[PDB]
Amino acid sequence: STGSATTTPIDSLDDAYITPVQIGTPAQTLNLDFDTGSSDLWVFSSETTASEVDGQTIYTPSKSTTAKLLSGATWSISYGDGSSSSGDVYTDTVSVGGLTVTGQAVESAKKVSSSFTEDSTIDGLLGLAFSTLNTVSPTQQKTFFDNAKASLDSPVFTADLGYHAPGTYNFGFIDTTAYTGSITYTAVSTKQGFWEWTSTGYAVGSGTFKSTSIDGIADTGTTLLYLPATVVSAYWAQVSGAKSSSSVGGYVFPCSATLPSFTFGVGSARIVIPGDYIDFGPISTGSSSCFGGIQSSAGIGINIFGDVALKAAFVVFNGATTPTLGFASK
């Protein structure tokens, strides 16, 4: 089998992407944030504290003839940005772009933190990291991909995120029309439960490529590109007036600037992030100070190839017995 679904930016800055997901019988369609950096499929629901729901579409398990309470199971998750959610668990039928999993753990939120409440466009998350990170207790549950894998034509999914435009998540096949040149594959460590890999270096604008190993994670659920302070300083030094602002929480730059591109290495291959992808707009409405899309990972404890990087590529998440990651230009 295969599946194919369009993923759509939630706003004009590509702060996140939402993909429609069918849950239950009859289908209840929720728009979920597909997150290769976590491993829980959780939804706003009829069980979510009412004051914490503000515009989201909810899953109502009592209206699904295939929903079953997973007795005794609870979940609770905290994300890198400090947001969180928790609740109980149902199993139900979940379909993405025509690909159907029966008995998928659907984690129903009883509580969500303010950032979730305040984002009316995201109805939940669909985790695509390794199932070892799933938070369901006392019996850990499998991701949608892990459940689908054996049925797929090939044990892969691909992320093709757009810049200020829709893109595509495919399951079970590689669309050879969706990229240019070849896909370069690179080794993955699953030891921390992430799609963790090592970039071979970087360049800033038309500058020379610096060969250096940068370990980090391919994370569709993180907006920005988080890299070591040395790398980030080298980038922003090429933007007149750019500076790190402790009050704002990162590098900012004059909105009048033209940003240079940023290149990262995948083996001997190179992915080029155009400068415009690195502009996240005014820090506050009407400001002429703009927020940068490349930020320091210092104090995160891990480098993160988030949407800023991934959207410059066609990305293969290869879930073969030994997983690997592939990157192509597009």
From Swiss-Prot:
List the EC numbers from the record.
Answer: 3.4.23.22
Name the record gives this protein: Endothiapepsin
Query: For this protein, what is any one GO molecular function term?
Result: aspartic-type endopeptidase activity
Biological process (GO) annotations held by this record are:
proteolysis
- For this chain, the annotated S-S bridges are C255-C290
Q: Which family does it belong to?
A: Belongs to the peptidase A1 family.
* UniProt key word Nucleotide-binding: no
Q: Does the keyword Ribonucleoprotein apply?
A: no
- All residue ranges annotated as the Peptidase A1 domain in the record: 17-328
What domain of life does the native source organism fall in?
Eukaryota
Q: Which sites are catalytic?
A: D35, S199
Q: Which chemical reaction does it catalyze? A: Hydrolysis of proteins with specificity similar to that of pepsin A, prefers hydrophobic residues at P1 and P1', but does not cleave 14-Ala-|-Leu-15 in the B chain of insulin or Z-Glu-Tyr. Clots milk
Q: Which UniProt keywords apply?
A: Aspartyl protease, Disulfide bond, Hydrolase, Protease, Signal, Zymogen
